[PDB]
Symmetry: D4
Subunit: 231 residues, 8 copies
């Protein structure tokens, strides 16, 4: 009796199953930025209140990439002299973390899926260049003495979904570099997070641990070019 009716109740709930699953957001975040397209002018400007005069930093982010090219920028900090200060991006299947210069990069192979949220986070300290990438909370890659003894200066432009090219011409950003998908939980810290801290940054009810420099839901992140807040 009850089982038979439960059959049709489940059949009905199937309609809302996918509708709720498609708009699900990771952690406890109630807002995210949507890049519906790889444009020549789509990006998001971040305006940290605290200066970026940082020697050690651990930048985490929740990403869901619809299409990943040879080079797709998640977030990137770049000054006038050197546009590749901090730059997390995605290759065809790997994740690349660039600190200091374009030549100093750390690559973690084949642990990013397209339509699934992943907590990509990258740590780096200037004492000996001990850089690491954690994906979904477990170590993905690590290297030492890369960009060692380097300090990212102030005045640089930090963006999400693009690299420093400027939009004083009505865009001008390289389309192939753009990011198309969803971003949330963008946090940057002034110190190397501990292992447990990195694990708990990408948990279930974890969208309330925000960095001091850039904090999701606190810092001025304004999208441009077509990106929008999908609350």
């Amino acid at each position: 009796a009850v089982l038979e009716e439960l059959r049709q109740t489940r059949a009905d709930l199937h309609a809302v199953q996918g509708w709720a699953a498609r708009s699900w957001l990771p952690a406890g975040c109630e807002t995210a930025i949507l890049f519906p397209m790889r444009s020549k002018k789509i990006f998001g400007s971040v305006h940290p209140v605290r200066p970026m005069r940082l020697e050690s930093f651990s930048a985490c982010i929740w990403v869901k990439a619809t299409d990943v090219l040879n080079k797709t920028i998640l977030f990137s900090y770049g000054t006038k002299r050197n546009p590749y200060e901090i730059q997390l991006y995605l290759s065809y299947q790997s994740i690349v973390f660039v600190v200091g210069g374009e030549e100093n990069k750390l690559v973690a192979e084949a642990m990013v899926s397209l339509g699934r949220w992943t907590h990509l986070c990258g740590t780096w300290n200037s004492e000996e260049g001990l850089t690491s990438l954690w994906v979904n909370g477990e170590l993905a890659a690590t290297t030492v003495e890369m960009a060692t003894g380097h300090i990212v200066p102030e005045g640089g432009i930090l963006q999400i979904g693009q690299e420093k090219n400027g939009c004083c011409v009505g865009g001008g950003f390289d389309e192939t570099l753009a990011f198309s998908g969803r971003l949330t939980g963008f946090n940057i810290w002034d110190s190397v997070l501990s292992n447990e801290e990195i694990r708990e940054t990408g948990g279930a009810e974890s969208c309330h641990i925000r960095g001091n420099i850039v904090g999701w839901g606190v810092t001025e992140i304004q999208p441009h070019g077509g990106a929008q807040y999908v609350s």
Copy 2:
């Protein structure tokens, strides 16, 4: 006991039944463009990165038409000399595919419903003009030697929901030509898709197969005039 309570549980879930059903999206697409009204200025501009110098193409699309007139444009590619290069549209009850010139068209009669999503897709190769229309994955119509030996040139304007008229006067598009409804999953390929490929393009978890020329969620599709992204 449990059955009685299940009665009221189902009665309660009835309230969310329609609310979830009305905003349901086809395939796995999490975003779509809404044309709430037939205006003189409503359309959506598409900006393919790859040039449209194509001899064979298979253009798929998910459409839900609120009202269909004698001539309602779903998508249309048109150059300066000939505005009817590629044009998929809807008659009162039939679906029309135009390639090359307005005289060359293929008509499939009475398989489009108003308030229901349908995966209209049109294939065409210039070797002998073998054109086809598949609706919901099964062949709807086919013809041979139409617009044969024709090449759609570059520089043309591609739009969704309207035809090439231009909006340098504050609109100017013919209202009767406009489209009012919902569009999603707009993909254009550079080659004739195989039968299984066409079948799987309009499946359940099928909103991740995108064309190389125009790909939903990848290409710059910007609405104008009142059209908007209903995420």
Copy 3:
């Protein structure tokens, strides 16, 4: 066993109960206009393609009013000479239908609730001025020989939520006249709808019967001043 866990399943579904109920829309309409506030500049312009040279008309509408004043305009058609051609509005508790002139009005007392959708609809034919108001499908009021032998001319401005005052000064509309709430299913017909037609216009799956003059989801309705499309 099953009953006990069903208790907590219902407790869980309670959280989504109200969230789905609050954004529920009447009929089968998937889109509506939200007037969040009574501003000096909030309204919605309607642009019928067919001229308003009508002798008989039946104008239906779905309304949910957050706050109703001495005079709150739902929709209003007004020419340059006479701004009170057609005007449906709400008094403190009654519904008023004005056709032809401000002196010719029909009042139906105390059948409008604030936070609940109601299908207010008004019919009028110029042969003898036989005007009627139906609320939720059942007759609310009726009168004869009011504005008889009158023809509403063309060129008039039709708005939803305000009356004809113009916004060439940055607003100027009377705040007290404004409408704050939700509107959907705005339809105007060129003929007096039959009783069954009026009953089925405000049904359950009834948001696909649209008028020839103004049709919800077909005609150009553009909000202004703060009103927005709440899909």
Copy 4:
């Protein structure tokens, strides 16, 4: 049998549990303002129709603060001469109510949570300065003879999420003062609400009791700088 199936039914409903919980709104409010970030230009201007020439007032509000600093403004009324006429704000953990002057403040310690809605409401009468703060319906703090014999004049600017600084320079608001979170049910009364009235203002189906001076869903509350209506 039924129990086993109910196990996976609950497992499935878990996906929509959090999705519905994250966008839940308090009382019966169907609309709210979202401050996604602490910008230099984010706020919301309120335009009461009735003048603020009030001697006694009870200002209620529903707030959900993502991050609370040393000084975070929920709402603030300020004239040209004295910008601190009325100002409700949040310290690190306490709630502060300022009436008349910045020196006259009432502080209620440690009853505000970050990610949870709370019905903060403040009452004040000028007969003897008997001011009170109610949090979630129960008394949080109270004092007497503070700003006694004072009248808040007219012409002042009332904002939500910021204090009176002006935005004729492209912002200029102090970032640290800004509010980042969600606001709803902003009501201001011309008289001291009774205890039962304050209790029922922050109830379950209580988002229909609105003040005469400022009423949520009635008064012109236009956000600026990045604040949004999250319907």
Copy 5:
């Protein structure tokens, strides 16, 4: 000797003769409004600080009409009920002054030239409707008992170059009624000016006598649609 070189000096000054003559402005006026075209939406809004609750008024204007149709509006004040309260316009060759309603008007035949500045001033007192038109300082046409015992109420919209038709439709102003040319010295008084005052208003150094209700260079005149301030 000197006489011979004077010929070349005059020939040189010839190049600046016309260039200075074309941009010459009448009276001592240093600024004027240019209506380059008869757009569908060209006009200028006037926002008098003092209310238009006037019984007797004198209104002057310096006009240079590039093209005059059957009906070309210089300025027009109109309320919601009656859009033809005050309206000065030009027929093919005559000047028409309308006060109260279209039925009662004053016409002065054939004293307006196209490319030449003319100082048109219409006066009217409600005691007996004694209305007069003065062109370039000399009386043109006078009538008595027209719109007698009439009072132009407040709230009406006053414009230059168009009638009261509203621009909430993206224009909508009748193209034919538009004004294309140059306007300056728009003044409206609360009392019928004396003959000597009328003569002095249209003098040489006379762009410093301005009306109390509307005063050129003091009142808020906002051009729209293509009209611009030609300083």
Copy 6:
């Protein structure tokens, strides 16, 4: 004595000589459109009130071209089907008039100077295609039976300085075809002007003879992309 001081008077007037000469305008025209650069999106839309359903037409224009390429468009009228209905342009040194189609055209060799105003007027009647080009009032080149028995239809877009390419893509107009310089006195007639009328149109005090279809200072000309009205 007088001659000596006249020397310095002439020396002084030298400073204003060039300043007045550079901003000189031809005919009695007091306004003109300036195309400072050959932008990708610079043009001017023209919106004739009278439809372009014309069989015979004479079109004049005063032009001062800063730089003339292989193809520089002064004005161009083009429909959706055929964008080359009417098109007057400049080759490296010649003036080209196109009516009907690109195949049939009239060319007048080497009578256009760059920095000097020239009055180019092309006439054409459909009775036998008798087309003529008049430069500065004297006939330049005439031909017969070109585009004979052809009628330019309605709906076509008419622009100055560009072709019909549409700006819904944020521009897209071919840069090379653009016009950079100054334009004025754009007039189009519904009949072939007589020889004396053609001479008078390009006279000294001749900026008051305007066409019925398009008339300078009467028709609606909207510059776009960087073009502006240089009064």
Copy 7:
């Protein structure tokens, strides 16, 4: 002979006499701000690079007032706490300099003409409040011990033509306080200028002496509401 022709040469030059006189600018200034009207929202923001933490200051300005009311503001610097820090304004016929607060002010009677440029410069040093007003280079009125021992703090907003009221309400500036006319040569110094320097600031070729804090043609002055640069 020469004298006779010189008569007509002078008659010719008469046409350009007034045209050049009306647009004349004082000093060697090549640009100025025009306030065509006393709008509700007309002003000009000034953004000094150097902070206003000044104890002694001299502030000059060239002013030409079309209409002067009971209180018309030339420039005004005001902080959040005290909006009347520095404020130079005009009464019906006198010039008023306000430093520190409203109570302490300096008044110079009847030396301002409406349509004539005047060089008003107010100096003030905090050692003993020795404040002075210089009009056209000759001292107008001086006082001692007014606002003595006072320091104007930083963060205050400095405007020309209005007070500190804010425009986040779409204006809100008091209309009466507005300034309508022309302004130029706005300079503010960090030290009390010497008498010879004061005289030289208002000379003939004197639009190249600019203050260190605010300098005309160097400091960032943005007109708003209708004000514009009349070059």
Copy 8:
């Protein structure tokens, strides 16, 4: 007789002397860009049609600087990697030409005046780095083997009045580097100009010699931030 009246004629012409002198433009240039202030965001973008893949180039510009700081940029071309490719700027009194990098530069001491137009042209060929600076047509300073064997690549942004800092942050350009004054005749050539050509570029009727890469009145120059075209 004639001499006496000529005295007053000269006295009258004195009034227009300065008014014509202040708006005088050099060469035969009829248009120029005005930088009224040193805003945080004032500049002008230049969009050369021909790519900047140049080995030898000569770049001229007419400049009139109101205020010159330690570093004031006239024009600057900079790529992403190296923002200092080409950069002409002014020190306190000298003119500096930078090609390749900041380390290698050419300085010409003390030949720039503030309020006077000067024709600064820098030439450089990569064969041996033979760079030269010509001021007003006479060589100022030359050097050899500086940036030798260097090629300025494509994609770099070229601006007038600022460096390459990007305006995606709502400005961000360094205020000190900005340029405040007037610019015209901006030309860049693909080959080192000859000495006679250099002299002719800065002549009297010399505003018709324009470069192939960037040509004044041909290339797309868009002012931003407050800069405007002073025709």
